[PDB]
DNA sequence: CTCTTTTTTCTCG
DNA sequence: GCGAGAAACAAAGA
């Protein structure tokens, strides 16, 4: 999941479970709560979920005053509400049990986490990741953006994935995104000009405001999202570009599966 | 059978 | 510092 959908996620929870008690916390798979399983299940449950946030693909789960669970769903990860007589499924690891129901994580490539920090922890939590602005017309900054640009040799679309320009873009939306700005995915940052950038800019405020619209792309929570049916390059090799008659290539850049139209996207 | 394909962090040179 | 490659892991396709 990206930003988009795990905004999706993010506020279907919030009309499910906030104001809910947890009434208890279990584990098969301990090993993804990175704080210790034992101090999160002693320290939440008893609690009840006050609000849910996010930065960039970072799920925030706000329970109590004082403690926030920091969940990053990575590359498979899944929430769902069930029952609280629901059968296990083979890659279920976690479940938050409320008095009637339970939120329960699944994730099969077993790479999604969960960190309890403390509420005046969190900021300090993604000042640490240099985590980028988010990518809202209000916070993502044009002229930064555009200097740290001009600073770097690095390649445009694994700088961009570094989540330290602007946050939230993953393998899908970065590919949508230098489509949409007519930008080959290779470009070294230092010769983008000023109206590249900008259209750049603008691109990655519109692309990911769109897939947040539509639900997030859908190929459990989250999981009746519409943008899917709108991607324009990703996944889509061999098919015809929507900006000229040419077809979309696939290459590998810095270890990323990457769509583009060559005709349409030269350095 | 082998090899490749699908977010973030770590290692090595 | 850098970039390249691999690692965490599971399942599927060639
Ligand atoms: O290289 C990266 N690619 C993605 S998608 N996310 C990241 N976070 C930190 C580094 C990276």
Redesign the pocket.
């Given at each position: 999941?990206?930003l988009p959908e795990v905004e999706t996620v993010r506020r279907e929870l919030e009309k499910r479970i906030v104001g809910q008690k947890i009434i208890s916390i279990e584990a098969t798979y301990p090993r993804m709560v990175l704080t210790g399983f034992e101090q999160l299940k002693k320290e939440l449950t008893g609690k009840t979920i006050q609000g849910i946030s996010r930065r960039?693909?970072?799920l925030i789960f706000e329970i109590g005053d004082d403690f926030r669970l920091i969940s990053?769903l990575?590359?498979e990860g899944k929430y769902r509400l069930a029952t609280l007589d629901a059968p296990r499924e083979?890659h279920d690891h976690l479940t938050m049990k409320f008095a009637d129901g339970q939120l329960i994580y699944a994730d099969?490539?077993?790479?999604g986490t969960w960190e309890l920090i403390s509420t005046d922890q969190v900021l300090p939590y993604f000042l640490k990741?240099k985590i980028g602005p988010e990518p809202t017309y209000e916070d993502f900054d044009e002229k930064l953006f555009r200097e740290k640009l001009r600073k770097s040799?690095?390649k445009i679309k694994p700088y961009l994935?570094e989540?330290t320009l602007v946050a939230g873009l993953?393998?899908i939306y970065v590919d949508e995104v230098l489509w949409l700005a007519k930008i080959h995915p290779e470009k070294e940052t230092n010769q983008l000009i000023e109206s590249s950038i900008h259209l750049l800019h603008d691109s990655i405020i519109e692309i990911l405001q769109k897939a947040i619209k539509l639900g997030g792309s859908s190929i459990a929570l989250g999981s009746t999202g519409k943008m899917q049916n709108e991607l324009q390059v990703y996944g889509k090799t061999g098919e015809k570009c929507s900006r000229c008659g040419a077809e979309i290539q696939k290459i590998?850049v810095?270890?990323?599966?990457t769509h583009f139209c060559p005709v349409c996207q030269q350095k």
């Open positions: 999941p990206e960039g693909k970072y990053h990575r590359m083979k099969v490539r077993k790479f990741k040799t690095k994935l989540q993953g393998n590998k810095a270890g990323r599966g």
